[PDB]
Amino acid sequence: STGSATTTPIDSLDDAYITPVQIGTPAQTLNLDFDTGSSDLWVFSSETTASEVDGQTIYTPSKSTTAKLLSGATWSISYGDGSSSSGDVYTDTVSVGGLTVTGQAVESAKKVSSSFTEDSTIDGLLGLAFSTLNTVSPTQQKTFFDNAKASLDSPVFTADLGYHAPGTYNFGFIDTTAYTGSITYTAVSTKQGFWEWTSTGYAVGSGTFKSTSIDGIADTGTTLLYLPATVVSAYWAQVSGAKSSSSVGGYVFPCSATLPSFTFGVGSARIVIPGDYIDFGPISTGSSSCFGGIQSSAGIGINIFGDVALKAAFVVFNGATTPTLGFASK
Numbered sequence: 450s451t452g453s454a455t456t457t458p459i460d461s462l463d464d465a466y467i468t469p470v471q472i473g474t475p476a477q478t479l480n481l482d483f484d485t486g487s488s489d490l491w492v493f494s495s496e497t498t499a500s501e502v503d504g505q506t507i508y509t510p511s512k513s514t515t516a517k518l519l520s521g522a523t524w525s526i527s528y529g530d531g532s533s534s535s536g537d538v539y540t541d542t543v544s545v546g547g548l549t550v551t552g553q554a555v556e557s558a559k560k561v562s563s564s565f566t567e568d569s570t571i572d573g574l575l576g577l578a579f580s581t582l583n584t585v586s587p588t589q590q591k592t593f594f595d596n597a598k599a600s601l602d603s604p605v606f607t608a609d610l611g612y613h614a615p616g617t618y619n620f621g622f623i624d625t626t627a628y629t630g631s632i633t634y635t636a637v638s639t640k641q642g643f644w645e646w647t648s649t650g651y652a653v654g655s656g657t658f659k660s661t662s663i664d665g666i667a668d669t670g671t672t673l674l675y676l677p678a679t680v681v682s683a684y685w686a687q688v689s690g691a692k693s694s695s696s697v698g699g700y701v702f703p704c705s706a707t708l709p710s711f712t713f714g715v716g717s718a719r720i721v722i723p724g725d726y727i728d729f730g731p732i733s734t735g736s737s738s739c740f741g742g743i744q745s746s747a748g749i750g751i752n753i754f755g756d757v758a759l760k761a762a763f764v765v766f767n768g769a770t771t772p773t774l775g776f777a778s779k
């Protein structure tokens with residue numbers, strides 16, 4: 450089997466991407482944030498505290514003939530940005546882009562934090578990291594991908610995120626028309642439950658490539674590119690007037706600037722992030738200070754290749770017995 454679904458930016462800045470997912474019988478379609486940095490499939494639901502729902506589409510298990518309470522199971526998750534959610538669990542049929550999993554754990558939110566409530570466009574998350582991070586207790590549950598894997602033509606999924614445009618998540622096949630040149634594969638460590646890999650270095654603009662190992666995670670659920678302070682300082686030093694602002698919460702730059710590109714290494718290959726991808730616009734409406742898309746990972750504890758980086762590439766998440774990650778230009 451295979452699946453193929455379009456993923457669409459939630460706003461004009463590509464802050465996140467939503468992908469329609471069919472849950473239950475008859476289908477209830479919810480727009481979920483596919484997140485390779487976490488491992489829970491959770492949704493706004495008929496059980497979500499009413500005051501914490503503001504425009505989201507909800508899953509109502511009582512209207513699904515295939516829903517079953519997973520008795521005794523609860524879940525609770527906190528993300529790197531401080532947001533959180535929690536609730537109980539149903540199993541139901543879940544389909545993505547024509548690919549169907551029966552008996553998928555669908556985690557029903559009883560509570561969500563303010564940032565979820567305030568984002569009317571995201572109806573929940575679909576985790577695509579390793580199932581060892583799944584938060585369901587007392588019986589940990591498998592991700593959609595892990596459940597689907599045996600049925601897939603090939604045990605892979607791919608992320609092809611657009612810049613200010615829709616893109617695609619495919620399951621079970623590699624679309625050889627979706628990228629240019631060749632795909633370069635690189636080793637993955639699953640020790641922390643993430644798609645964790647080591648970049649071979651970076652360049653700023655037309656500058657020389659610096660060979661240096663940068664361990665980090667391929668994370669579709671994070672907007673920005675978070676890298677060591679040394680790397681980030683070198684980038685922003687090439688932008689007149691750029692500075693790190695503790696009050697704003699990272700690097701800002703004059704909106705009048707033209708940003709340089711940023712290149713990261715994948716083995717001997719190079720992925721170039723155009724400068725415009727690094728512009729996240731005015732810090733507040735009407736401001737001439739703009740927020741940068743490359744930020745320091747100091748204090749996060751891990752480097753994160755978020756959407757800013759991933760949308761510059763066609764990315765293969767290879768879930769074979771020994772997982773690997775592939776990157777191609779496009």
Ligand SMILES: N=C1N[C@H]2[C@H](CS[C@H]2CCCCC(=O)O)N1
Nearest residue numbers: 486487528529532564565568670
């Ligand atoms: N600023 C927000 N944070 C949460 C809501 C909707 S997106 C969500 C954060 C998802 C993080 C995923 C992850 O860190 O792996 N708004």
